[PDB]
């Protein structure tokens, strides 16, 4: 409903909703990570099996996509994937209705457009940084090889793909949020159960798809 900000005024305007959500989500992720990996064995112990299977699936999807040097951006891609996964899981699994935010509302990190735009700019600038590191510093992939008319078209498409990823993430998050909000606002909360299950499945699928799309832009940077 109200998705703007809370005026925690420092320097300029700020949105406290995504700040609180990002702090909570990153804290929960790092706290789950460090607790079971403080002493990991070679055998897959309690949290070790889950963390190792996650690292295995991420390394599989990364080594398949980018090609050879899939090791250097593996923590970046895993950070993007797990951040989106945990945000999409926790924005739906965490109740924000019994507790009241005075200034606005606050449910999930990627509900604001700024979160998706920042992750998109991070991925796009990382792709351009890998293109500058791998290809020549004079002209990167904006060079018009096949015909002499595709330079600004390729530059505009490269500028558009980040915003495409950000729009995909914002669309999924706002779709789940509006679905839960309107389904609860219709009537008492017993009706929307199968749609909520479908939304959870869509959240997991969107997490895997965001991981794959980040790996796709990374393979484009590898090109």
């Amino acid at each position: 409903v109200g998705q703007h900000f809370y005026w925690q005024i420092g320097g300029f305007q700020i949105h406290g909703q995504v700040l609180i959500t990002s702090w909570v989500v990153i804290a929960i992720l790092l706290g789950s990570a460090a607790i079971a990996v403080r002493s990991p064995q070679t055998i897959p112990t309690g949290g070790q099996n889950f963390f190792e299977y996650v690292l295995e699936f991420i390394r599989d999807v990364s080594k398949t996509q980018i090609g050879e040097e899939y090791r250097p951006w593996v923590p970046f891609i895993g950070t993007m994937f797990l951040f989106i996964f945990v945000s999409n899981w926790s924005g739906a699994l965490l109740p924000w209705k019994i507790i009241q935010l005075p200034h606005g509302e606050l449910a999930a990190p990627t509900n604001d457009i700024n979160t998706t735009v920042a992750l998109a700019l991070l991925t796009s600038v990382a792709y351009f940084y890998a293109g500058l590191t791998k290809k020549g510093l004079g002209y990167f992939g904006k060079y018009i090889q096949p015909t002499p008319i595709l330079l600004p078209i390729n530059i505009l498409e490269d500028f558009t793909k980040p915003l495409s990823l950000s729009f995909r993430l914002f669309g999924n998050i706002l779709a789940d949020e509006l679905v839960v909000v309107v389904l609860v606002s219709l009537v008492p909360l017993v009706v929307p159960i199968p749609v909520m299950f479908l939304g959870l499945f869509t959240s997991g699928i969107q997490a895997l798809i965001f991981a794959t799309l980040a790996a796709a832009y990374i393979g484009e940077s590898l090109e």
């Binding site: 460090a34 923590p75 604001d112």
Partner: peptide, 27 residues
């Protein structure tokens, strides 16, 4: 609406990246 929550989230995410690398991913 593009506020400073974008840099707040990016800063909190890079710490989680390096923390996952230090805690679980390298070990």
């Amino acid at each position: 609406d593009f506020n400073l929550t974008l840099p707040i989230i990016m800063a909190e995410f890079l710490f989680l990246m390096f923390a996952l690398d230090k805690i679980y991913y390298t070990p």
